[PDB]
């Protein structure tokens, strides 16, 4: 028979959101960055480090879950808008240094070339040798190698996901 709810089209796994944000370091003194965070699992997961609200920075570009998300989460900086233009969410870049990203964007739905240039950029954000984490769903990177650039590292898989969850980590080469 037909089953429903097909993709990834439910909330990502509370398992899969504790490994994601036990990349982070909440002892720099540094913000975090959380880009697609939707209904606030991830969101919930990265608060739970210890991280201060005010330190939080998320990006979500829908309008009905950034009202809701404020509304969820005092204190959590949440920006309405599109994380691929890091300018236009973040403002230009003079200095602001993020302890890691923590990304949930559907990285499937942008060209590759987007992706690559995404990522180059969020590393600039981070101290060189700490990570951008993204989720994905295939058997390989959603992002291509390009080793001048980036290193990349298989981080967890998580089979009680629906669907089943690849985590990826990414640091500066
Ligand atoms: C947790 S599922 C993916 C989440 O990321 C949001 N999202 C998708 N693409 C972007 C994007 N370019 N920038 C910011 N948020 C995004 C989506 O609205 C959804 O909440």
Do not use: C
């Amino acid at each position: 028979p037909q089953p429903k709810k097909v993709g990834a089209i439910v909330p990502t796994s509370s398992i899969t959101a504790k490994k994601m944000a036990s990349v982070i370091n909440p002892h720099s003194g540094l913000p975090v960055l959380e880009l697609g965070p939707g209904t606030g699992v991830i969101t919930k997961a990265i608060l739970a480090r210890g991280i201060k609200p005010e330190s939080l920075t998320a990006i979500e570009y829908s309008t009905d879950f950034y009202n809701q998300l404020l509304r969820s989460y005092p204190g959590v900086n949440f920006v309405n808008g599109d994380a691929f233009d890091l300018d236009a969410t973040l403002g230009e870049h003079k200095g602001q240094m993020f302890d890691s990203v923590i990304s949930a964007v559907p990285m499937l739905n942008f060209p590759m070339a987007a992706r690559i240039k995404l990522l180059d950029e969020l590393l600039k954000r981070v101290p060189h040798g700490r990570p951008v984490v993204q989720i994905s769903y295939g058997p390989i990177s959603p992002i291509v190698a390009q080793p001048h650039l980036y290193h990349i590292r298989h981080f967890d898989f998580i089979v009680r996901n629906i669907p089943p969850a690849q985590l990826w980590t990414y640091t500066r080469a």
